[PDB]
Design an enzyme around this catalytic site. Structure first.
Site, PDB file in Angstrom:
ATOM      1  N   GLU A  83       0.845  -1.171   0.000  1.00 30.44           N
ATOM      2  CA  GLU A  83       0.000   0.000   0.000  1.00 30.44           C
ATOM      3  C   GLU A  83       0.899   1.246   0.000  1.00 30.44           C
ATOM      4  OE1 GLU A  83      -2.553   1.621  -0.984  1.00 30.44           O
ATOM      5  OE2 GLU A  83      -3.958   0.452   0.167  1.00 30.44           O
ATOM      6  N   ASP A 140      -2.046  -5.142   0.905  1.00 32.80           N
ATOM      7  CA  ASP A 140      -1.355  -4.084   1.579  1.00 32.80           C
ATOM      8  C   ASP A 140       0.022  -4.436   1.992  1.00 32.80           C
ATOM      9  OD1 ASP A 140      -3.403  -2.037   1.749  1.00 32.80           O
ATOM     10  OD2 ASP A 140      -4.384  -3.344   3.074  1.00 32.80           O
ATOM     11  N   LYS A 168     -14.978  -7.524   2.793  1.00 30.28           N
ATOM     12  CA  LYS A 168     -13.665  -7.634   2.239  1.00 30.28           C
ATOM     13  C   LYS A 168     -13.370  -9.016   1.672  1.00 30.28           C
ATOM     14  CE  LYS A 168     -10.826  -4.035   2.810  1.00 30.28           C
ATOM     15  NZ  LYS A 168     -11.416  -3.020   1.928  1.00 30.28           N
TER      16      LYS A 168
HETATM   17  O1  LIG Z   1      -9.702  -0.790   1.160  1.00 25.77           O
HETATM   18  C1  LIG Z   1      -8.581  -1.057   1.547  1.00 25.77           C
HETATM   19  O2  LIG Z   1      -8.462  -1.316   2.776  1.00 25.77           O
HETATM   20  C2  LIG Z   1      -7.495  -1.062   0.515  1.00 25.77           C
HETATM   21  O3  LIG Z   1      -6.215  -1.260   0.915  1.00 25.77           O
HETATM   22  C3  LIG Z   1      -7.777  -0.842  -0.781  1.00 25.77           C
HETATM   23  C4  LIG Z   1      -6.798  -0.901  -1.933  1.00 25.77           C
HETATM   24  O4  LIG Z   1      -5.595  -1.014  -1.778  1.00 25.77           O
HETATM   25  C5  LIG Z   1      -7.367  -0.850  -3.354  1.00 25.77           C
HETATM   26  C6  LIG Z   1      -7.382  -2.307  -3.852  1.00 25.77           C
HETATM   27  C7  LIG Z   1      -8.372  -3.165  -3.120  1.00 25.77           C
HETATM   28  C8  LIG Z   1      -8.005  -3.852  -2.004  1.00 25.77           C
HETATM   29  C9  LIG Z   1      -8.919  -4.641  -1.385  1.00 25.77           C
HETATM   30  C10 LIG Z   1     -10.231  -4.740  -1.822  1.00 25.77           C
HETATM   31 CL1  LIG Z   1     -11.437  -5.752  -0.951  1.00 25.77          CL
HETATM   32  C11 LIG Z   1     -10.594  -4.026  -2.951  1.00 25.77           C
HETATM   33  C12 LIG Z   1      -9.663  -3.242  -3.588  1.00 25.77           C
HETATM   34  C13 LIG Z   1      -6.342  -0.201  -4.310  1.00 25.77           C
HETATM   35  C14 LIG Z   1      -6.072   1.235  -3.919  1.00 25.77           C
HETATM   36  N1  LIG Z   1      -7.130   2.006  -3.328  1.00 25.77           N
HETATM   37  C15 LIG Z   1      -6.853   3.451  -3.648  1.00 25.77           C
HETATM   38  C16 LIG Z   1      -7.968   4.470  -3.358  1.00 25.77           C
HETATM   39  C17 LIG Z   1      -8.419   4.722  -2.050  1.00 25.77           C
HETATM   40  C18 LIG Z   1      -9.476   5.638  -1.885  1.00 25.77           C
HETATM   41  C19 LIG Z   1     -10.068   6.324  -2.964  1.00 25.77           C
HETATM   42  C20 LIG Z   1      -9.624   6.108  -4.235  1.00 25.77           C
HETATM   43  C21 LIG Z   1      -8.578   5.179  -4.435  1.00 25.77           C
HETATM   44  C22 LIG Z   1      -8.465   1.525  -3.589  1.00 25.77           C
HETATM   45  C23 LIG Z   1      -8.713   0.009  -3.541  1.00 25.77           C
HETATM   46 MN   LIG Z   2      -6.377  -2.299   3.005  1.00 27.23          MN
HETATM   47 MN   LIG Z   3      -4.454  -1.799  -0.032  1.00 23.77          MN
END
Ligand SMILES: O=C(O)/C(O)=C/C(=O)C1(Cc2ccc(Cl)cc2)CCN(Cc2ccccc2)CC1
Ligand SMILES: [Mn+2]
Ligand SMILES: [Mn+2]
Length: 178
Positions: A61, A89, A115
């Site tokens: 991440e 992450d 999730k």
């Molecule tokens: O939700 C988390 O806990 C998480 O770590 C999310 C992610 O890393 C993203 C990938 C992802 C990870 C997990 C799941 Cl269940 C769905 C998507 C990629 C970057 N992320 C970037 C982002 C954040 C907020 C707004 C726009 C983009 C979005 C989804």
């Molecule tokens: Mn996450």
């Molecule tokens: Mn992530």
């Protein structure tokens, strides 16, 4: 709320959160709870990576997309671990698994299910935190020792307290969607 984030998160986290929002065409100055959540999740990510021994985790991440997948594909190649559908992450070199870390303003069990269902993986470990002391990790394996965990849960509590002192918390608490 914009002031609170700028104040309570370090500048590298705040820049990452800005960039993530602008990549979806959102304005940190208007979607300030989202802004705050993003920052919060990043801080937890880094805190957790620091809960290991020296070389225990790889941080995924916070990296740009090409670099993040470069790390992920390189691990999958050098370890035989199978390739996640979404960026995780962290990778845990000791347990040899990817980790997905969630931070929820709702309840841990609901966010865990959400999730798990979005990921498609018998293999990525999921670990969820709340702002009020709860965790839910896969197969009840919380990966880090209880003292590392406590430093995370405490920091989230402190964040929540600080928001509520500024009257930001009610709104923040109610801003996460299913
Ligand atoms: O939700 C988390 O806990 C998480 O770590 C999310 C992610 O890393 C993203 C990938 C992802 C990870 C997990 C799941 Cl269940 C769905 C998507 C990629 C970057 N992320 C970037 C982002 C954040 C907020 C707004 C726009 C983009 C979005 C989804
Ligand atoms: Mn996450
Ligand atoms: Mn992530």
């Amino acid at each position: 709320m914009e002031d609170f984030v700028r104040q309570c998160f370090n500048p590298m986290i705040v820049e990452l959160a800005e960039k993530a929002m602008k990549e979806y065409g959102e304005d940190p100055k208007i979607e300030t709870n989202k802004f705050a959540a993003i920052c919060t999740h990043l801080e937890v990510c880094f805190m957790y990576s620091d809960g290991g021994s020296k070389h225990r985790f790889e941080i995924i991440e916070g990296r740009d997309r090409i670099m993040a997948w470069t790390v992920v594909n390189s691990i999958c190649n050098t370890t035989g671990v199978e390739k996640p559908k979404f960026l995780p992450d962290l990778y845990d070199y000791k347990e040899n698994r990817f980790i997905e870390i969630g931070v929820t303003r709702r309840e841990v069990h609901i966010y865990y299910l959400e999730k798990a269902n979005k990921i498609k993986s018998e293999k990525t470990h999921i670990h969820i935190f709340s702002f009020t002391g709860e965790e839910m990790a896969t197969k009840a394996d919380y990966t880090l020792d209880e003292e590392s965990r406590a430093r995370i849960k405490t920091r989230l509590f402190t964040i929540r307290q600080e928001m509520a002192s500024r009257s930001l918390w009610d709104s923040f608490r109610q801003s996460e969607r299913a």
